[PDB]
Automatic annotation (TrEMBL), chain A:
Name the record gives this protein: Large ribosomal subunit protein uL24
GO BP field: translation
Domain of life, source organism: Bacteria
Organism per entry: Bacillus subtilis
GO molecular function, one term: rRNA binding
The family this protein is said to belong to: Belongs to the universal ribosomal protein uL24 family.
Gene: rplX
TrEMBL record, chain B:
Organism: Bacillus subtilis
Alphabetical list of PROSITE patterns matching this protein: RIBOSOMAL_L15 (PS00475)
Protein name: Large ribosomal subunit protein uL15
Keyword rRNA-binding: yes
Region (Disordered): 1-57
MF terms in GO: rRNA binding; structural constituent of ribosome
InterPro entries: Ribosomal_uL15 (IPR030878), Ribosomal_uL15/eL18 (IPR021131), Ribosomal_uL15/eL18_sf (IPR036227), Ribosomal_uL15_bac-type (IPR005749), Ribosomal_uL15_CS (IPR001196)
Gene3D superfamilies in UniProt: 3.100.10.10
Keyword Ribosomal protein set for record: yes
Ranges of residues in domain Large ribosomal subunit protein uL15/eL18: 76-144
Composition bias, Basic and acidic residues: 1-13
UniProtKB/TrEMBL annotation, chain C:
GO BP term, example: translation
Organism annotation: Bacillus subtilis
Region (Disordered): 47-84
Gene3D superfamilies in the cross-refs: 3.40.1370.10
Statement: the UniProt record of this protein carries the keyword NAD: no
Name the UniProt record assigns to this protein: Large ribosomal subunit protein uL4
Length: 101, 146, 205
RNA sequence: GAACGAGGUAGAUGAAGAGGUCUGGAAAGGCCCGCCAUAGGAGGUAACAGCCCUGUAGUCAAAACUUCGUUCGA
RNA sequence: GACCGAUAGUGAACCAGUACCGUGAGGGAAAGGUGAAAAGCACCCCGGAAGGGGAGUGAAAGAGAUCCUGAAACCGUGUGCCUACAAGUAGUCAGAGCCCGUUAACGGGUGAUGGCGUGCCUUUUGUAGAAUGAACCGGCGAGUUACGAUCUCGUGCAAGGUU
RNA sequence: AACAGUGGUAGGAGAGCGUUCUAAGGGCUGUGAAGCCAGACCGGAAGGACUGGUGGAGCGCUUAGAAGUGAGAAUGCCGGUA
């Protein structure tokens, strides 16, 4: 997908609209993307093996990649993505900007 | 006229007769075929000449004569068709074909004696009738046999 | 048959005389209808086959004896009233086209063109030259020519560059001067013609 | 029994709006505004998307096998 | 694709030529759908559990594992009216009483009582028939197409029409 | 307007109603479509609206075409339940 693990991204649709977040997950098997601070589900938790706790765990939940584009690192608005090569390895270059990633 | 106001020619469209659907239309339970007949069952037709075992008409009637492989059916044309061509012109079977007066030359062109002709022609045809010859000689044309 | 001539940028010129035998004929509604129905049926391909009783992978044996059994008398397990299948008089693969006389089809196409003339949706665009296949140029051309609904453009020689550009619109298509039909003419409700194709179709008819 | 052009088998590049606002759980929906289009095929995108993504039109790409066109007698 | 949308469409959308049956050749099924995301029920009470009741998630819990929607047969629970001197193809129409009040209109439900009145279909000269068929509910299930012919109708040309 | 007529099996003819697709034009829909459930509404008929509840995404209308187009019975077939 156009997004990668470890990217600063911006979300479009859903209840969470127009909020910043970082990426620490990726699911290319299902185009499924977990962003920080979005889809704030509250999972019911039983004790886990020898862990003696019982409660509701409030944690992240992943969203679809089609609702996420990354931002321009220069101007800061959400921008479209293009592909370009730079001295051997190809690089991810956002549209309407010359900067990479 | 656009498509969303399509009108056919009235009387040029007829609804299909869906037999054996309900009783209000008629042709209901029996589907318009009566009762218990031989014709009333599927594939129940009789042979088209067959009349109940009674020895049919074509069998009761005898046979007639032959036909021959040699049969010269001549292309018929009467004198009235000759009036279309102009005065003093030459007519040939090929020009007859191009004018389309005869659609098939086949065994041969033959003029026949119906119609009034008052024109001078040079007619080239394989066979003539005697009335045709006297008519063209009365008109002043020349009937020569190809 | 005296439609005014228009230029590329919406400018108008002297009007063009048109063939009376082609464009002034009183149209025949029934003939136009039948010509519509003709190729309307001809476009469909009618591929549909459903398995008749004799070819449904089974049947074969008699399920049980005729007499001495409380069940009704019954043939093969694959049978019309039987659940497993075997349909009777289903759709069959077949052709849905026929043919009409040359005189009838030429009369129909003359009728529809003349009808377009008499309701005045014909706009003639002589020498339709575009140096690039970009779409927004002919979009601005059409906005200047003031067409909003669907349309049809006929240009014979410039087709190689116009056809890429104008194919962008779903409701708008180019046609060659040869390929004039009835559905495309009636449906597109606004016939764009060039004078070269005018004379070409004129001598064709 | 050579080298040459075009295909095939992996692929790459590829324009345009989180536009404002309303309902809504979620806008691809409604209203008011723009842009691309050789690309308005299609699918997915919390509901009906050309401009969200995969893509699509074009434009390219083969280390290795494979298929087609130019060389070696009266 | 003027083809089907899960009794359809391949037998087979689902671990199907499987399960199963047959000694063997062979025959040959049924069985799709939570949610956008499992975020799939932490915790409390009853209980051995199952199952429930709460609390929580969701837009929905009647959405909680055949889990979209959930018709009918069938089976229950409260009830407004009526019913233990009446025999009744079980209706219809008169009809008092009682209860209710509507897509407001010479309204709705129930009906003590009176008159008349032997189901449906098929096949028959003739059926309430003691002739036949149906336990019920739901789904499926029978005159089409091809190629010719003929007739009518309507179109285009017309002594020509036509590929 | 007047006159006359209007039982009905096999049958024959004419008018139609409805369903699924397909084009044409029009529009309806999360401010809740299809479907389901309930009403004391409308037409001569097949049927068709309106208002509630459920339901949670597709569907009418206009005109024409094409049909796997209309079930109560076949000791019909399958599923469910008496």
């Amino acid at each position: 997908m156009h997004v990668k693990k470890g990217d600063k991204v911006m979300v479009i649709s859903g209840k969470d609209k127009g909020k910043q977040g970082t990426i620490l997950a990726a699911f290319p098997k299902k185009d499924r993307v977990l962003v920080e601070g979005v889809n704030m589900v509250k999972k019911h938790s039983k004790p886990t093996q020898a862990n003696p706790q019982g409660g509701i765990s409030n944690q992240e939940a992943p969203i679809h990649v089609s609702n996420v584009m990354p931002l321009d690192p220069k101007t800061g608005e959400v921008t479209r993505v293009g592909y370009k090569v730079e001295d051997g390895k190809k690089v991810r270059v956002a549209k309407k900007s010359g900067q990479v990633l | 006229m656009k498509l969303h106001e399509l009108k056919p020619s009235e009387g040029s469209r007829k609804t299909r007769n869906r037999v054996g659907r309900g009783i209000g239309s008629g042709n209901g339970k029996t589907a318009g075929k009566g009762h218990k007949g031989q014709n009333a069952r599927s594939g129940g037709g009789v042979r088209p000449g067959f009349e109940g075992g009674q020895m049919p008409l074509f069998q009761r009637l005898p046979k007639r004569g032959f036909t021959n492989i040699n049969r010269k059916e001549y292309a018929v044309v009467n004198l009235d068709k000759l009036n279309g061509f102009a005065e003093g012109t030459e007519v040939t079977p090929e020009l007859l074909l191009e004018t389309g007066v005869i659609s098939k030359l086949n065994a041969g062109v033959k003029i026949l004696g119906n119609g009034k002709l008052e024109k001078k022609l040079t007619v080239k045809a394989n066979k003539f009738s005697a009335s045709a010859k006297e008519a063209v000689e009365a008109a002043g044309g020349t009937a020569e046999v190809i | 048959p005296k439609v005014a001539l228009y230029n590329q940028n919406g400018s108008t010129a002297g009007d063009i005389e048109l063939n009376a035998s082609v464009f002034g004929i009183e149209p025949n509604e029934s003939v136009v209808f039948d010509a519509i129905l003709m190729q309307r049926a001809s476009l469909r391909q009618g591929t549909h086959k459903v398995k008749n009783r004799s070819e449904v992978r089974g049947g074969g044996r008699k399920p049980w004896r005729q007499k001495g059994t409380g069940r009704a008398r019954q043939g093969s397990i694959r049978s019309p009233q039987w659940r497993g299948g075997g349909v009777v008089f289903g759709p069959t693969p077949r052709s849905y086209s026929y043919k009409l006389p040359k005189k009838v089809r030429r009369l129909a196409i003359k009728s529809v063109l003349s009808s377009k003339v008499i309701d005045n949706n014909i706009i003639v665009l002589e020498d339709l030259t575009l140096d690039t296949a970009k779409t927004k140029e002919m979009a601005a051309i059409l906005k200047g020519l003031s067409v909003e609904k669907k349309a049809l453009i006929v240009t014979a020689d410039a087709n190689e560059a116009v056809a890429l550009s104008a194919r962008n619109i779903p409701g708008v298509t180019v046609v060659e001067a040869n390929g004039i039909n009835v559905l495309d003419v009636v449906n597109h409700e606004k016939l764009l013609i060039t004078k070269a194709a005018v004379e070409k179709v004129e001598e064709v008819l």
